[PDB]
Ligand binder design. Structure first.
Ligand SMILES: Nc1ncnc2c1ncn2[C@@H]1O[C@H](COP(=O)(O)OP(=O)(O)OP(O)(O)=S)[C@@H](O)[C@H]1O
Ligand SMILES: Nc1ncnc2c1ncn2[C@@H]1O[C@H](COP(=O)(O)OP(=O)(O)OP(O)(O)=S)[C@@H](O)[C@H]1O
Ligand SMILES: Nc1ncnc2c1ncn2[C@@H]1O[C@H](COP(=O)(O)OP(=O)(O)OP(O)(O)=S)[C@@H](O)[C@H]1O
Lengths: 189, 398, 398, 308
């Protein structure tokens, strides 16, 4: 009789699910028109045609994907924001993590963020995103775990890209799961 | 011929240490006094200070420094280990001498002198540590392993000792400790976290160890849970994780080989499953078996004295000890009948462990003749029957 | 007829290397003459700089080579082969040998000149690398593998090899190194990260190796916890990265062969579980067992000498080694009966792991002496009792 | 993945040095010749079966990777009429597993866009050396009771189908090493047709290995007395009769017989080993060197018998 160990994917897939998510949201949040409608994860995902931006995401997320794997991350926030780097659309992926159901309910996620353009009011185009990595340690403790990437550097919690406000949450999702408490919600301003 | 004395000083009393040292010198050297204990009477102020004075094995020309102590009345202190959501106590933590372990070291009776060897081991450890003998030329890893048939006083000697030493080594080491390890918290379902936190637990023990006055006593009960033999089979049975923990304990049992304020008391009763690289690191490897006739008689003496003190027994009568019994010549007299008959009960009940030997009065008064106060003239017989029952209770179990 | 002589010079002094070289040179020119060492020097400057001089094996001054070394006193500098996200120790990177490794070679005593075998093996490695021998027509990967019962010195031999090789190659290489890789801190709970960590670890090793003069001995003490049986650990599935780390390890070791200054010392208590692709990739699959009667005699000689030094035993005596005992004729003329009794103990102490063999004087003293100071024959008979009791403990544990 | 443009300075001494007596090397040669000739001949696979896959297997450390590399060299130089050059690709299975699919899929897709760019010009002859194939079936055996299969099994299967995607053209060869002789759960066991077994070299190969080793030891005067040794053709025409000129050959032949089945890589390390332990000298004479090599082969046998 064979008792046996396990092989978790727990903390990493999230951000790369965010990858799909962000590749979707960068599309849906109307902050990408260089996006193209494609097919992935059995949904009408809208991705980017630029392999250059694909590698930009490789740097931004897929370099920190095992670095984001620390469980200290509270709010993986896609701040959808103007030139001032302050949110209008706080896609707060409040990752309340209790450590294929993940895509079983991110089916609803991707699908409804896709529908979010029927909920998201007309956000002005020409506004970018920042990936605010809310950890359990304030003011960007342990620069190494955030600047893991050699070619891709990181910065501390400088006063501009550290704060957010105007938290009107219409919880477009509350999709609790087994591994994840993906309390995603779109806090409008 | 040095003879030791322990003095229990209450938690209520507050008189400083040396004051009660000199007080007990006045006491003992006004009486000017194998093991005979006195209570805290015969003088007012010491009655307000001390509780009991006990001697351990005649003119007492050379005495010891009085071992004077307060029991701590706070039990375990659960200490989790995981960074987040431990929810499983990984290590209980007494600060000796605790309250519960009191009188434990004296109830246990071995008539083979396991206590003597297991005691002098630490004294010689100190002797070689203080005079600075080179590690390379003579060395030892500090591990004690105890094995035998189940229920013979193996976990009760790994804890009655971690108190007795702190009483003996009070002048040198000023507070003992005791860490009871919860083996089943160390393992983990996750891929490599099964040993990656055994190292964390031994790191915490080390962090406790650095204070060079502490006298840490790491205790591992039922070691086979922690060092199961490495060669089970090639299949998924005992996954790759159970090959790398048993050699993660072994790489920590020797990284705390250099300190001299550490002992590692460990118990197990099924030895043939302990890995062989652990069954050799051990420094004493002591075997304690079910008690013999004299130990049985002493156990029954203790039980009877406790009951007739607690009045679950009719007006009490005195009992004779093997020394006095041999001195009188086994003659049938006005008192010796009880001694001889209890001797037969002892001479009948060999082969049983300690647990049953201590249950037996309770069953013999719980099943057989029951009348809330029972005379010893009958109660001894009421025990004998119970003895036979156990043997019968074995045969029907085959 | 090359004869090596090495001098330990005290860390306080700072005299220039060649001046003290010529000074100890005319020291030998004063001596002009068996492995012998001195500490009772005469010349003042000689006393201020050097602590000891040692001759290592009737050859007066045929030819000598002189090595000078500076023992370090600071411990290993730990390192975290991680991005500081998770705090886990990775390798205890040493430096040119610390004072903890001093005397280690002298302590270890082996039956038939295996020590010299590894010595001239590494010497031959550098010698062949010197003649620019073509790599493809004849080649060799450096891996050494020591295996056998527990306690035979195999995790005490790699460090001593690091020591004496860094001492001997001092004329050719200024400093050595040592990297005791921690096997359990390489895997991860997430899958596919063990492969990412192993390549970073060995890439760090390559960085440390890049200085073509800097000598590096990687030490993998528990390879059987790092190289799981590749086919056996696939039946009864482990996670993906169980036989996905063995392949990467093998690839990096096969890669490391093209660097001039590398040795890879590995040890294993269990051979039936290591691998089939590894247990044949090692050059010297050297087998070390329990020491024989002569090695045991030398062990006990070292132990008794040390106890005479630290005054655990009061009267200093003289014990004739075996090669003197040959010439004396083994007569009973009251000069060498003590060494004869020690030889009898060496005879009856066959098969012990050789770690118990250093332990045994301490155990004997503790259990059967119960005194703080003794003569020699008492300690010998106590050691006899101790070896007998070790046999009894082995018997009763089955 | 690794990459080799053409047999380089590291790619002559192998095939000039790898020595098997069953002449399996010529067998691999003409097998691949038949494969390529049938392929350009447009024979149909249904009636007569032919695939561009060759599998090599046997005990570990017997030449399989070196044999694959040297075979690639030999075939790309021999085929001096169709392909001007070749390309050798060593695809390591380790570096393909990201955290989850949506990264590993793009990674393998990029790798095989590079592969398609390479093969787009059919001027050359391209190889792939899937080093170990059992590292793709172990990850597939864990559908339950292991890691998240969506990130392990799916990726390896998406590589296994891309293998059949690449194999479809007319100038590709597939080379693999397995090291198990019963079967493989991947579709490279039953569907493979060139499944050659490699074992330890036979008694006639130990002589040719040892003579090359001794010659290399001669090249830089490690052995001082430069005495002349004779190829096995000489010992067979002479009649195996002792004399004053062909005795070293005799002793070395007895050695070769004694060293039958150790390994390929080991019978190449034995002179160094013998010199390291049993010679203890900076320069050696061949007469005692052969006795030392005798002691070394005895030692290697004793060790392989000593590991229980
Ligand atoms: N020699 C003894 N004499 C009297 N009682 C004993 C003796 N040895 C053990 N006991 C009883 O053992 C009771 C405690 O049982 P435990 O000692 O827990 O058994 P164990 O001996 O711990 O064996 P394990 O491993 O835990 S099976 C003690 O309270 C003693 O009464
Ligand atoms: N020839 C010898 N004579 C006396 N003592 C020796 C000898 N060789 C080794 N030792 C002792 O053995 C100790 C080192 O043991 P190791 O060889 O490190 O044990 P180990 O092989 O790592 O144990 P494992 O991991 O369970 S196989 C040293 O402290 C030495 O005192
Ligand atoms: N029969 C042989 N004849 C000549 N040279 C050999 C022979 N066997 C090995 N060699 C050389 O010795 C080394 C052995 O390593 P490899 O050829 O890579 O073995 P392998 O094919 O990888 O076996 P595994 O199953 O992967 S351990 C190589 O440098 C070979 O070139």
């Amino acid at each position: 009789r064979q008792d046996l160990n396990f092989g978790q994917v727990v903390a990493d897939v999230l951000c790369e699910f965010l990858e799909v998510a962000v590749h979707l949201i960068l599309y849906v949040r109307e902050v990408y028109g260089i996006f193209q409608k494609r097919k992935k994860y059995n949904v009408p995902v809208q991705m980017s045609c630029h392999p250059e931006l694909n590698q930009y995401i490789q740097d931004t997320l897929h370099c920190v994907k095992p670095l984001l794997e620390k469980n200290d991350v509270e709010k993986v926030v896609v701040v959808i924001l103007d030139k001032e780097h302050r949110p209008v659309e706080k896609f707060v992926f409040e990752i309340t993590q209790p450590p294929s159901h993940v895509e079983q309910l991110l089916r609803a996620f991707i699908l409804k963020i896709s529908v979010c353009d029927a909920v998201l009011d007309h956000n002005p185009p020409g506004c970018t995103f920042t990936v605010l990595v809310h950890t359990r340690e304030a003011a960007t403790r342990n620069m190494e775990k955030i600047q893991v990437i050699k070619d891709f550097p990181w910065i501390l919690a400088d006063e501009q890209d550290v704060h957010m406000h105007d938290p009107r949450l219409i919880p477009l999702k509350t999709m609790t799961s087994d591994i994840l408490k993906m309390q995603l919600y779109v806090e409008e301003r | 011929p040095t003879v030791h004395v322990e003095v229990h000083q209450r938690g209520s009393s507050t008189a400083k240490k040396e004051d009660i040292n000199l007080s007990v010198r006045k006491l003992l050297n006004r009486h000017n006094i194998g093991d005979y204990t006195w209570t805290e009477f015969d003088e007012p102020f010491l009655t307000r200070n001390v509780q009991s004075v006990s001697i351990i094995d005649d003119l007492s020309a050379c005495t010891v420094a009085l071992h004077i102590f307060q029991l701590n009345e706070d039990g375990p202190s659960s200490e989790n280990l995981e960074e987040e959501t431990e929810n499983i106590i990984a290590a209980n933590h007494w600060v000796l001498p605790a309250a519960e372990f009191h009188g434990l070291w004296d109830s246990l009776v071995y008539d083979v002198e396991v206590k003597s060897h297991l005691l002098d081991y630490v004294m010689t450890t100190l002797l070689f540590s203080d005079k600075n003998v080179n590690s390379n030329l003579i060395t030892w890893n500090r591990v004690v392993l105890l094995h035998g048939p189940p229920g013979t006083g193996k976990t009760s000697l790994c804890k009655a000792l971690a108190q007795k030493l702190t009483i003996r080594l009070s002048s040198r080491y000023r507070y003992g400790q005791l860490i009871e390890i919860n083996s089943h918290s160390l393992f983990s379902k996750w891929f490599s976290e099964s040993g990656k936190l055994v190292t964390k637990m031994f790191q915490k023990i080390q962090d406790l160890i650095d204070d060079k006055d502490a006298l840490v006593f790491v205790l591992i009960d039922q070691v086979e849970s922690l060092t199961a033999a490495r060669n089970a089979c090639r299949a998924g049975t005992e996954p790759s994780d159970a090959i790398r923990v048993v050699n993660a304990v072994l790489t920590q049992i020797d990284q705390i080989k250099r300190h001299s304020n550490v002992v590692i008391l460990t118990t197990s009763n099924i030895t043939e499953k302990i890995d062989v690289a652990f069954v050799d690191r051990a420094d004493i490897k002591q075997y304690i078996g079910p008690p013999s006739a004299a130990a049985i008689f002493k156990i029954y003496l203790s039980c009877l004295e406790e009951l007739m003190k607690c009045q679950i027994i009719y007006p009490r009568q005195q009992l004779l000890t093997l020394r006095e019994l041999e001195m009188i010549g086994f003659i049938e007299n006005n008192v010796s009948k009880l001694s001889l008959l209890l001797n037969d009960i002892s001479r009948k009940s060999e082969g049983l462990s300690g647990r049953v030997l201590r249950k037996l009065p309770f069953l013999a008064h719980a099943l057989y003749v029951q009348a809330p106060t029972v005379t010893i003239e009958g109660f001894l017989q009421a025990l004998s029957l119970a003895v036979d029952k156990q043997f019968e209770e074995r045969k029907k179990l085959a």
